[PDB]
Amino acid sequence: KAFDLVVIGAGSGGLEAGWNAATLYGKRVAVVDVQTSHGPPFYAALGGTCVNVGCVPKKLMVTGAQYMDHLRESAGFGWEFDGSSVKANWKKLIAAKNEAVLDINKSYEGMFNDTEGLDFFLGWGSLESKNVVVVRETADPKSAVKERLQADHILLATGSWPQMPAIPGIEHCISSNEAFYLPEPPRRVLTVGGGFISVEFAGIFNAYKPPGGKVTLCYRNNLILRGFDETIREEVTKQLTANGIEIMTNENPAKVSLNTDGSKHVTFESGKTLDVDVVMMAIGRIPRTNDLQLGNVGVKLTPKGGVQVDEFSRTNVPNIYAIGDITDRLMLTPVAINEGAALVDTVFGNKPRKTDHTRVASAVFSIPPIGTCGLIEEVAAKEFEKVAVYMSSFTPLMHNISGSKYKKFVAKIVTNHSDGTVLGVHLLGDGAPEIIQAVGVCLRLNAKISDFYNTIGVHPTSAEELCSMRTPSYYYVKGEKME
Amino acid sequence: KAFDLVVIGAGSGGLEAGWNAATLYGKRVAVVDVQTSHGPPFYAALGGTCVNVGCVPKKLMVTGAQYMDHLRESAGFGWEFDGSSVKANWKKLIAAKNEAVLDINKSYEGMFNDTEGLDFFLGWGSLESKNVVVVRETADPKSAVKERLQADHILLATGSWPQMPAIPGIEHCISSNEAFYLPEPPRRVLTVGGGFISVEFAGIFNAYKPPGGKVTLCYRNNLILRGFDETIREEVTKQLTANGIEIMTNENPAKVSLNTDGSKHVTFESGKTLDVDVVMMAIGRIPRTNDLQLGNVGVKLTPKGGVQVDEFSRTNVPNIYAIGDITDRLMLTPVAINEGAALVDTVFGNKPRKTDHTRVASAVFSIPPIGTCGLIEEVAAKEFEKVAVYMSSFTPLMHNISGSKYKKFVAKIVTNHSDGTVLGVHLLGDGAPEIIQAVGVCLRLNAKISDFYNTIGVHPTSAEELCSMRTPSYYYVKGEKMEKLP
Ligand SMILES: Cc1cc2nc3c(=O)[nH]c(=O)nc-3n(C[C@H](O)[C@H](O)[C@H](O)COP(=O)(O)OP(=O)(O)OC[C@H]3O[C@@H](n4cnc5c(N)ncnc54)[C@H](O)[C@@H]3O)c2cc1C
Ligand SMILES: Cc1cc2nc3c(=O)[nH]c(=O)nc-3n(C[C@H](O)[C@H](O)[C@H](O)COP(=O)(O)OP(=O)(O)OC[C@H]3O[C@@H](n4cnc5c(N)ncnc54)[C@H](O)[C@@H]3O)c2cc1C
Ligand SMILES: CN1CCN(C(=O)Nc2ccc(F)cc2)CC1
Ligand SMILES: [Br-]
Ligand SMILES: [Mg+2]
Ligand SMILES: [Mg+2]
Secondary structure (H helix, E strand, O other), X not given: OEEEEEEXXXXXXXXXXXXXXXXXXXXXXXXXXXXOOOEOOOEOOOOOHHHHHOHHHHHHHHHHHHHHHHHXXXXXXXXXXXXXXXXXXXXXXXXXXXXXXXXXXXXXXXXHHHOOXXXXXXXXXXXXXXXXXXXXXXXXXXXXXXXXXXXXXXXEXXXXXXXXXXOOOHHHOEOHHHHOOOOOOOOEEEEEOOOHHHHHHHHHHHHHOOOOOEEEEEEOOOOXXXXXXXXXXXXXXXXXXXXXXXEEEOOOEEEEEEOXXXXXXXXXXXXXXXXXXXXXXXXXXXXXXXXXXXXXXXXXXXXXXXXXXXXXXXXXXXXXXXXXXXXXXXXXXXHHHHHHHHHHHHHOOOOOOOOXXXXXXXXXXXXXXXXXXXXXXXXXXXXXXXXXXXXXEEOOHHHHHHOOOOOOEEEEEEEEOOOOEEEEEEEEOOOHHHHHHHHHHHHHOOOEHHHHHOOOOOOOOOHXXXXXXXXXXXXXXXXXXXX | OEEEEEEEOOOHHHHHHXXXXXXXXXXXXXXXXXXXXXXXXXXXXXXXXXXHHOHHHHHHHHHHHHHHHHHHHHHHHOEEOOXXXXXXXXXXXXXHHHHHHHHHHHHHHHHHHHOOOEEEEEOEEEEEEOOEEEEEOOOOOOOOEEEEEEEEEEEEOOOEEEOOOOOOOHHHOEOHHHHOOOOOOOOEEEEEOOOHHHHHHHHHHHHHOOOOOEEEEEEOOOOOOOOOOHHXXXXXXXXXXXXXXXXXXXXXXXXXXXXXXXXXXXXXXXXXXXXXXXXEEOOOEEEOOHHHOHHHOOOOEOOOOOEOOOOOOEOOOOOEEEOHHHXXXXXXXXXXXXXXXXXXXXXXXXXXXXXXXXXXXXXXXXOOOEEEEEOOHHHHHHHOOEEEEEEEEEOOHHHHHHOOOOXXXXXXXXXXXXOOEEEXXXXXXXXXXXXXXXXXXXXXXXXXXXXXXOOOOOOOOOHHHHHOOOOOOEEXXXXXXXXXXX
């Protein structure tokens, strides 16, 4: 069969691209994915990683984890109930999450039936030649051919995959993929990694752990959440600890063995040991290029294994494009979606558009959560002669009553002090992901600190902190911090 | 006894002006208020209405109220506990709120003592003459003079006060003032009014009511929350009804009598009756101008009763200014604050600045809450030839799981369709007040709909809805609503 566009991976980017090509530019479109619904054995499926084993289910499970805090905090506002009756039923959470994800799976199924010129093929897509995608039974290129799809244009949109360290006993460890399908909540869990996935799952496991349970998070470096604002990294460390999570920094697993009872015996590089029920490896995600047989067409890969792309998502082979995590730039669903739209607008619209990977608002669904947009100060301080930092950090009033006095809201604005232009906004606290979205719009409009502090506050809110900062807390002058 | 600035009312507006003048321009400032800490008899005190009997305590109490929904909603996420053991202890909430408000009262006391040239005076401020404020012991102009303050400049910042309809048995009724100090949560309560205070208090009472309790909100017209987006007004009405609140529209108390058991027999103009333990009037607030003796120096009031001001907060009388609720415009703490900061930068900083009363973000801590900034579509449609409305209304996935399927999230953007300029943004749902703040900055930057839709979403959030809307849902053309443009 012959298509204007064949999309390998029915994920965030691949579905946006395919749908836009078909419906907006009236192209005939094929899309390939390995599974029609969520879970084992391939985890990602129709909808992509976000829908199946990413943003969507994880946000539901963090929402669930948040009730641990709400139930406790309710008491400061006069709520009374039998604390000893309280159970976190993980099986119910997983069932609710599964129905939500399956409902999305099914609606995508329906979208493919009801959308003329948009066809779904099940199985493993790879490049036979520069105008032919072969769909096969398995990831093994010797497996049976299901389809051969003639393609004017080929979009690689296979996303990323958990990185597992080659340590002895790696097979006794899981990734985020398996974490979504644990039948029981682990009593003892080690999350390995200081990134958003380790931290978000550490919060999930901490809420649902059975009595006398314990969540440990380990990270090879000194401070979790590298890439985030340093004040936020320190505070989220403190606030995780105050909710009973053990943060082991400068620690990394050397090997894993099974204890006699089938629990995992963890030996850290430091020699230290830890017995846990689950070891969840969240140390990175790598582009999924192994199965695509890109050697058949000579698409240039980076040493990392990402598809190399120009700003317009073009590979070195004309008619073959890559978007989303496979490009190993910003691994976020809205960026993949944005890349997908910009490509189809370029290729089929002659409306040439590149995704701006700068000033992308993002969140961490930690407890409490992070919202951030633009540059952290250390980065700004190398690219700008004078940087101002406006900082507000305090326990909001409601958390003095709640009893969570450790829950400092952090609001930080980083500016080019020469003209007041906002380079970065960094939030930690309840609502931070919701606050930061319209901040993304501000930074796209080249907002200055004066545009923030001349806006009238909404009171009482956490967000009004952003519009109450007149005076820098400190500066960077030629990379050097000054009071 | 001589001061650069005398401020009457140590409230949101008065303290901002007072503090700025003293600390920014080394000016010498007297601030007058009738009370140093919250509660009876005068309710407002040092800090003002917001701190003592307004935004601050209200928000704590709405936060308390929200736990009724969290406790129920937790079950969909697998939380289990003895539902029959759940009690809402109103007395605990009020004691916690009182301690929090008292600490702020004490925080302001420390501010005055620490700050050179910033002095507090206890008592009632009135105008003797153009340049003299007299502090008396009571609101009576005849009570003893505690002080005579010479003023190069006088600021009137005495705020507003609940209006109590002059109906038989109004003395059986309370205002928001008394609601903050009820010793027990009412089993049955009638909140009178369709504005934010009646709506917010209905939410609070609804969560804290003892068993067999019932919250009734009455409004004299057809649809609550006049001046908010019509879709949001209809949705809040449904979402409050879905949570057990009874909304009586086109209904208004004609009188109240005490039953022999201490309860209130309410008779509506319609002839309907209702027995409740509490009647809270929240039908309006009116500027506090009486006790200032404005008639002594001829400060002009408006046909509505508020102090007439120009864009610079100036009265007809030179050296006499008025900010905040006494001007009877937007009764919001951050506007009062902005006006005070602007006045002091104009008069003392030689940096004339006028408050922008357009594109002001605000909220209603309804459950769930409203966040809004700029024009509703009906108002835009009268000013602009072509208005586009972008609308997304849906139950978020988490509220399908929580069991609160009635919690439709509403996100509406109103534009000038001739250039895409965003004229107003209207949100209903969890987080709306937080989402809307940075939208206020967007509107100050003259953001177009394309500035929103070209910004990359934060996923998953409610807020990303605002960056997902490219196609108008409908339009006004020369004031006429229609699906499609001609
Ligand atoms: C635990 C976790 C949480 C996350 N949380 C967030 C978040 O909160 N917000 C956010 O913005 N991002 C989040 N992300 C990132 C987000 O999921 C990704 O950035 C996004 O899904 C990538 O989109 P994509 O189009 O690149 O690929 P994907 O959405 O991963 O889609 C790739 C698809 O290709 C399929 N596939 C792979 N190989 C083949 C093949 N050979 N043939 C056919 N099909 C194939 C896969 O089955 C999959 O469906 C999260 C990721 C994870 C793992
Ligand atoms: C229940 C309620 C909830 C509210 N919620 C919010 C909200 O969530 N967000 C928001 O932005 N706004 C809210 N408001 C409005 C907010 O409280 C006001 O807009 C704001 O306080 C007005 O500030 P001001 O400077 O005009 O005066 P105020 O803050 O009202 O200060 C006036 C002060 O003057 C004193 N005073 C009066 N007469 C005299 C006199 N003769 N001599 C000396 N002192 C005198 C009073 O004691 C008082 O302290 C709410 C109001 C109420 C009643
Ligand atoms: C871009 N938005 C995303 C959210 N959204 C929506 O409707 N979500 C949804 C809720 C519940 C459910 F069951 C399925 C989807 C509106 C459009
Ligand atoms: Br580090
Ligand atoms: Mg089809
Ligand atoms: Mg002093």
